[PDB]
Structures are given as C-alpha cells and as structure tokens.
Design a protein around this ligand. Structure first.
Ligand SMILES: Nc1ncnc2c1ncn2[C@@H]1O[C@H](CSCC[C@H](N)C(=O)O)[C@@H](O)[C@H]1O
Ligand SMILES: [Zn+2]
Lengths: 107, 97, 352, 94, 80, 179
C-alpha cells in the first residue's frame, strides 16, 4: 500500500534486479535462490559493461566520430590485456584485425 | 676400448622409456616444490597424498605432450637438436602465449 | 590526506606481539608480548625507543595515562601495576580472580582505574591507597560484564551478556538510564565490547549477532531509565557474515574501522552517510589480534601472528621542492604574464 | 502488434550516458553488447550452480557468486568486480 | 624457501624428453622447461586452493585437483 | 678542514640534479594506429620510459630505462606557449642571467618555452649521428611536439637529436658550427 521502489534504486544500480532474479529462478540452476545473489550479479555485470564502453568511447573519439561501430569494440577489447584473456575465443562480427607486420618482411 | 657411436644409446633409451609406465620425477623434491609454491596462496595448508600424486601425473603428461610438438617443430626446421625457440613456437601456435 | 590505502612495510623486530595502544598525541606505541615484555616504539623517528621487561607470563591489556608517564597492565598472573617510563619499576600488585579482561584509567584523573574481571563485577579502584568499589550488576546471574568510562569522565556505561545496557554515575553509582537492545524480533544478544570516540558523544556497541550499532550519547540522557532508543547507524557484512573482533573510531570521530575474526581484513565505513568505503586485505591465512588508529594522522596498526603492519599513504614525491621557481606542468598552457610587459614587527623567537 | 522481445538495450544506453555524456551507439554494436551480457551471465551462473552441486547444497547465495567471479575473471579485473558487488549488497541492506 | 625448482634435476628432463621421442637436446632447454612447469603448476594450485577455501576446509583433497584440471580443459581419469 | 679556505664555492646553477648515483608489438605508441590513439597513452608511458641523469657529454642528458623500439614515440616537449617576441626579452634577460636558450618553435608563429615551465624534454643533448627526431602532429585542433625514435635503443643509451660554436658531440660527421 506504500510507494513502490524498485530494488535497483534501493542498491544504487542501473541494471535490473528483478529480471536477474527471475532469470535465475527460471533457468534450472538450483532449487532455492538467495536474496543478495541478483544484487551481487547485477553489480558485476554493470561493472564489466562500463569497463568496456569506456575504452570503446575513447577509440570512437580518436577516430573523429560520434557513434560507436563494431571496429571500436574490436580495438578496445584487443588492446586491453585482461579483456583479451576473457574474450579470447570470441569472434566479433564486422570487426577486422590489428595492424601487425613481422620484422623480417619489410626492407 | 669399446664405445658406441653417439646416438645408439639415445635410441635404445627412447625405446626403453616408451615401453614402461612409471613416474619419471623423484617424488620428495616434487612434493617440496608443490608445498613451496602453494605457500604463497594460503599459509599452513595440509595436503593429502593422492593430491600430490594427481598433480604429478598431470604435470608429467603435460611435459611429454609439449616435447612431442617441440620435436615436430625442430624437424620442420631441418635440424635434429631441440632449441628453446621451438618450445616458444609450439606454445604460441597452440594458444598459450 | 584521509583514510589509508597502501600496505607500507611492517615492524618485524620483536616476535609474538599481542596487543597495542597509542597515547593522546600518537608518538608512542606500547605492545605486550608472550613472555612479559613491553616494547615501546616511536613514530616520530620510526625506531624502537625503550624495552622494559615486565614479568614472565604474557600481557593481555595495556592503557596509557593522561600525562603519558604511567602505564598499567593486566597480565595472566592477576597483576595490575602502575609502571614507570623513566625507571621501569613495579609498584602495586595484588591478585584477582584468574581471568582479567580490561583495565582503563579515568579520562581526567590518573587516580581511578576501572578493572573488568571476567567472572565478577566491575571494580573501580583508587591509586592514592588500596580502596576498591565493586560496582553493582543488575542481573547477578551470568557474571559476564564489560564496562568503560565515557569521553569526559562523567559516567560509566556497563553491559551484560543479555543485552541490557546500564548507566551508572561515576562516583555515586546512580542507576539513572537503561535500555535493552532491540535485536531482531524477540531474542536478545550478547555484548562484546564498548568503545568511545575522541570528539563528540557517539559510541558503538559490538553485539553477538554480528551487527555493529552506532548510538548517540545524548539520546540516552534524554530517554532516562528503561527507555527505548534506536541506533543512528547499523553496520554489518552479509556476504561473508564476518564475526568481528575489535573496533575503534577515527581521529576526529568520523570513520570506523572494524577488524575481522575469520579472514584477516579491515573494513572502513563512514559514520554520516554509512557506506562501506574500503576493505584492506592482507596475508591470506593469518589470524587477527588487535586494531589501532593514530589520533591525528591516518595510521592503522594491526597485530596478526606477532607482525605489526602500518598502512601509511605511500608518499610519492616530485620536483619543485628542489627548484621553487619552476612549475612541472603536464600539458601545454598558453598565456602572457602581465598586461604591462615592463615592517618593524618584533616577534618573540623563543616563544614555545 | 508483435510478440515482445526482452533485451538489454535501454540499460546499456543508461550506462553509456553516464560514462560518456555526448556519445551515441549504432544498432550492430548494441547487438554485440547484448550478446556479451548474456554470455557472461551464463558463464557465472553455470559455475555457481556447479559449486552448489559439489558441496551438497540447494541454494545459490552470494558467496557462490563471489567464488565463481573469483574463478572466472583474470586478476585485477576480479579484484575490482568483487569490490563492486560487495559495495552494492552493503548499500542494498541498509 | 628459494630452491626446489632446482630439485627437478637434469636427468629427469632428459627422461621426459626421451619418452617424448627426442634424440639430441641443447643446454638451455633445462631452464626453459623449469619455467614452463612452474607456470602450469601455479595456475592449477590457485584454483585448487580456491575450491578448498570455499568448502571451508584446511586440506587439499584429490577431488579439488580434479575439478581444477577439469576447469583448465584437461580431464583426468582414475582419482575420482 | 675549517682552515683551508679554497675556491670552487659557487657554480651559479638552477638545477642541482647532478647526483652521486647517476645510475644511467603490444604497446599503443608502437602500433600502427592513428595518431590520437598513440598520443593518449604517451604521457602514461613516458614516466617509466626515460629519465634524466649526469651526462658525460655536456652537463645532463636523457637516459632511458627500457628498450625503446624503432619508430615509436618517446616524450612530448611541452611548456609555455609564448609568442616569438617575448623570446627576445627572455634571450636578453637570461643573457643577463647567464641561463641558456630553451626555445622550440612549433611553426613560424609561436614558440614553446622550457625555462620557467615544462617537463623532462629539456635535458636532451645535441649530436651529429642521432637516434631521435621530431614532428608536429594534430590532436583535436591543437598542435604538439613529439620526439620519435630511429632504431631500437638499449637500456642505458643516451637520447639525442639534431637541434638545427664548438660542441662536445665528438661524432665523426661533426660540423663544428651549430647555426
Ligand atoms: N652535446 C653538447 N655539447 C656541448 N653543449 C651542449 C650539448 N648539448 C647541449 N649543449 C648546450 O647546453 C644547453 C642545453 S641544456 C644542457 C643540459 C642541462 N641543462 C645541464 O647541463 O644540466 C644548450 O644551450 C646547448 O648549447
Ligand atoms: Zn661537438
């Protein structure tokens, strides 16, 4: 009967907590799902999303652009060391490669 | 007086060690190595015996497969002697470094 | 600056440290050891100042006096001695029941010491002679009571193993204010330790349901006897659930540190907002013993397996202390300097 | 009238307008970000389920999620993800 | 402790190389192999100790080693 | 020792940086990326790339601590963005003060001052067979001065370039007149 406050606002997040809790309940992982588990997991997913969009926006600024296309995601992931170890066996579509010519091939 | 031409004892040791199934590392030095490089993760751990035996099995199998691929790299370079850049080529094509 | 961040060395000089405390100005550190030795360091010079052999059995309690010239301890041998920092001689010694928890001077007078025995009642003593006043306990059933003076020295807060806090007047034993802590729904919880700030009226209660409650020292005086106050701030950990071991306040009473009894970490909160601000990890498999805080400067002294660590801000330097006429910039700065391009004060020098 | 499709477009757009206030995003990059969020969710959820099965429990708590993050992310990235999750749970309780 | 990477001696690397099928070996293979083995063992020991800490124990059992190796992508039959 | 009053009591120097010790791809500045992708990572790398020590050649010099590769960025020369007539007042002023000239011009309009304000790109000596050079690049409308490299440079080797009077360079292709 009070005013409804969503669980994302109560924790200070941007990703939803109710949707993550539903997808854990309806996903055949365990029988019972605790209270703090979707809050922890939505915090982790928001951190990784912000960490990749920072570098992608920086590359998009350096190419004299406004929007972000898959080339900037490719450069952002492949230049960082730990994002490259996380996304190691992953193909990003319309991404291309990094410039790399071996030393013994140029005169 | 009697000496074998160099290569003969190498070939028959290849046959002798590919025929048997045993552990090829001494196990008290390996146990000390495991406890030492586990000491930097949690102080005063307490291993079982089958845990150290499982680690020794896995490590021996890894090194034998790495030496087979290293030997193929060295034969590809038209040599016989194995050099460490062959190890580097094998571990970089495989996807480890 | 503010609350510390970096690990910054250690003091691996004398083994088997057990407890620690600072004086009012934070220039000394007294630490009892495993064989009756009290080693005092310095933070002005970062060196050992004085080592005094106390006893043969270990020391589990220490307290500085107000002037800083007298120590007091409570070893396993039921020995409470008013020591000296100059001579280093035991003066007073008389036996108690065999476990003793805590000793504490009066915060204005070096005559009154408040000894808390384990299986007894609080006993307020004098040092001009051998008087002792056994303070009253309400329940008289469990005999597990912790107590301490407040900041100024006007009252003594007492707590039992049933969650009933009492307020006794410091000299006439006036049971004037009391409350029972609202723990969950119906069950009551124990009281582990009571600590007080250095500036203001706030204090903290370390209960046994692993929740730390931050009260206000004036709401109790407002509510009077058998009132029901509620805490200003409730601080806990719910991931690891973290049963706590030791807590104290910051320099001006702004931040709270709380060491853990399971994992060797240190958690720091704000008092005003109330959010977690930093966790300070360390050696993974040790065990925590004591937590200190330097009263005017951000230094924490954590004892764990005889090793005292000091988290001290990681001073990194620059130029322009050598060449004051130069400004080491980072990127280009454009300007022109000027819009026109070309007494008898006698001050005491020996005033302290 | 069509059947609804749940996604993560609006939330990624919120995070982007926090971190770069004058930057947009195209359609294909939003599809790549949606696939990335689903992938990382399924890895961490599967590992936490397997831990709860190994220790003979019936409950996924936040401690299993913490151990799965610690097993699955490399180094300093795990060191910061643990901090973000603990801070959000602490702000949620009070 | 500073030794025990020296305890992996230099007839032992020779015997592993001959089970691998190698006829003639250089003299830098020894230090290169010691580095390879130390990196592999660190990556396995770290995950085994993580499983042990989550189970709230103090001993590393054989199943924690098996689960660590199974995460690496290297299954091991005979110890479960 | 308290009595032998001797000479060598004054040197008239701004920096007492001459010390007793004087202990003289993957990275983004070495990749083939466009220019603002390299310029952003430049200032984070240059703190650990090089340093200043006691040069045997002339006073002080720039000495690396890590293997600079071929054709990459090393450091930016950045100070006061002054105009090319305050340079004349400062040349006469530090002619009266005895302090040398630190004046790179970006183009034929404005000059960068490195006397009162700047970074560690002052302490780079002159030579005749160098291993570094310079360009002027464009990062968001503004212009900058980047010291590149010419070949792979080993840990300890001094960095020099052509500035464009007898010099202590001593190289075989010397000119002995630096104007
Ligand atoms: N290789 C060289 N030999 C002789 N003089 C040099 C030189 N390189 C630079 N100089 C002179 O030194 C000035 C550069 S500043 C020299 C380094 C630093 N100021 C120091 O001595 O501690 C310039 O005016 C130039 O005339
Ligand atoms: Zn010259």
């Amino acid at each position: 009967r009070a005013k409804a406050k969503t669980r994302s606002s109560r924790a200070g997040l941007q990703f939803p907590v109710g949707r993550v809790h539903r997808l854990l309940r309806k996903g055949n992982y365990a029988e019972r799902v605790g209270a703090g588990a979707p809050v922890y997991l939505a915090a982790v997913l928001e951190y990784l999303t912000a960490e990749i969009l920072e570098l992608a926006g920086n590359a998009a600024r350096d190419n004299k652009k406004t929007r972000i296309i898959p080339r900037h995601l490719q450069l952002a992931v492949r230049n960082d060391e730990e994002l490259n170890k996380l996304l190691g066996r992953v193909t990003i579509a319309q991404g291309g490669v990094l410039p790399n010519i071996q030393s013994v091939l140029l005169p | 007086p009697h000496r074998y031409r160099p290569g003969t004892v190498a070939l028959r040791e290849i046959r002798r060690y590919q025929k048997s199934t045993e552990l090829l590392i001494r196990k008290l030095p390996f146990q000390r190595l495991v406890r030492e490089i586990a000491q930097d993760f949690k102080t005063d751990l307490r291993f079982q015996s089958s845990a150290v035996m499982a680690l020794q099995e896995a490590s021996e199998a890894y090194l034998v497969a790495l030496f087979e691929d290293t030997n193929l790299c060295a034969i590809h370079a038209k040599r016989v002697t194995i050099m460490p850049k062959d190890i580097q080529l094998a571990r970089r094509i495989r996807g480890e470094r | 600056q503010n609350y510390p961040e970096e690990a910054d060395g250690t003091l691996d000089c004398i083994s088997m440290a057990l407890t620690c405390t600072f004086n009012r100005w934070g220039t000394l550190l007294a630490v009892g050891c495993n064989d009756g030795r009290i080693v005092i360091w310095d933070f002005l010079t970062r060196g050992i100042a004085k080592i005094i052999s106390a006893h043969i059995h270990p020391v589990c309690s220490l307290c500085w006096s107000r002037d800083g010239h007298k120590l007091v301890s409570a070893s396993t041998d039921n020995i409470v001695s008013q020591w000296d920092v100059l001579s280093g001689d035991c003066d007073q010694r008389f036996r108690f029941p065999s476990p003793i928890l805590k000793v504490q001077y009066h915060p204005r007078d070096q005559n009154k010491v408040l000894v808390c025995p384990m299986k007894s009642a609080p006993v307020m003593l004098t040092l001009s002679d051998s008087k002792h006043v056994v303070l009253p306990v309400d329940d008289d059933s469990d005999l597990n009571v912790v107590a301490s003076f407040d900041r100024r020295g006007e009252y003594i807060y007492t707590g039992n193993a049933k969650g009933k806090i009492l307020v006794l007047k410091t000299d006439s034993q006036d049971l004037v204010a009391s409350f029972r802590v609202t723990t969950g729904t119906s069950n009551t919880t124990a009281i582990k330790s009571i600590e007080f700030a250095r500036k203001g009226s706030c204090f903290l209660i370390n209960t046994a349901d692993r929740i730390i409650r931050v009260y206000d020292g004036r709401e109790i005086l407002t509510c009077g006897r058998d009132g029901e106050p509620e805490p200003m701030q409730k601080l806990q950990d719910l991931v690891n659930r973290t049963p706590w071991k030791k807590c104290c306040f910051s320099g001006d009473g702004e931040y709270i540190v709380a060491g853990s009894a399971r994992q060797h970490a240190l958690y720091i909160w704000e008092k005003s907002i109330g959010n977690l601000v930093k966790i300070l990890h360390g050696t993974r498999g040790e065990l925590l013993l004591d937590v200190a805080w330097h009263p005017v400067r951000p230094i924490i002294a954590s004892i764990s397996s005889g090793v005292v660590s000091i988290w001290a801000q990681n001073q990194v330097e620059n130029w322009s202390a050598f060449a004051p006429d130069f400004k080491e910039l980072d990127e280009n700065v454009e300007y022109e300097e000027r819009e026109s391009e070309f007494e008898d004060e006698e001050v005491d020098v020996t005033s302290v | 009238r069509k059947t609804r499709k749940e996604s993560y477009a609006i939330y990624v757009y919120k995070v982007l307008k926090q971190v770069h206030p004058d930057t947009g995003i195209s359609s294909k990059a939003m599809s790549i970000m949606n696939s990335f969020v689903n992938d990382v969710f399924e890895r961490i959820a599967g590992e936490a389920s397997r831990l709860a099965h190994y220790n003979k429990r019936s409950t996924i708590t936040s401690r299993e999620i913490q151990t799965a993050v610690r097993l699955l992310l490399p180094g300093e990235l795990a060191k910061h993800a643990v901090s973000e999750g603990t801070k959000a749970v602490t702000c949620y309780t009070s | 402790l500073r030794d025990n990477i020296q305890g992996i001696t230099k007839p032992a690397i020779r015997r592993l190389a001959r089970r691998g099928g190698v006829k003639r070996i250089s003299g830098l293979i020894y230090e290169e192999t010691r580095g390879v083995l130390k990196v592999f063992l660190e990556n396995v020991i770290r995950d085994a100790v993580t499983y042990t800490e989550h189970a709230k124990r103090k001993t590393v059992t054989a199943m924690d080693v098996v689960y660590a190796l199974k995460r690496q992508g290297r299954t091991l039959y005979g110890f479960g | 020792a308290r009595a032998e009053v001797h000479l060598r009591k004054s040197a008239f120097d701004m920096f007492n940086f001459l010390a007793s010790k004087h202990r003289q791809a993957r990275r983004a500045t070495s990749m083939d990326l466009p220019m603002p992708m390299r310029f952003r990572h430049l200032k984070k790398t240059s703190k650990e790339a090089v340093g200043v020590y006691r040069s045997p050649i002339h006073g002080r010099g720039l000495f690396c601590k890590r293997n600079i590769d071929a054709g990459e960025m090393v450091i930016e020369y950045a100070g006061n963005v002054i105009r090319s007539i305050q340079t004349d007042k400062r040349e006469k002023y530090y002619d009266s003060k005895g302090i040398g000239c630190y004046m790179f011009r970006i183009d034929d309009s404005e000059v960068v001052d490195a006397t009162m304000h700047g970074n560690a790109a002052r302490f780079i000596n002159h030579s005749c067979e160098p291993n570094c050079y310079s360009r002027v690049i464009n990062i968001d409308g503004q212009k900058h001065i980047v010291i590149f490299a010419m070949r792979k440079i080993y840990r300890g080797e001094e960095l020099t370039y052509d500035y464009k009077l007898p010099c202590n360079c001593g190289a075989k292709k010397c000119r002995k007149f630096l104007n």
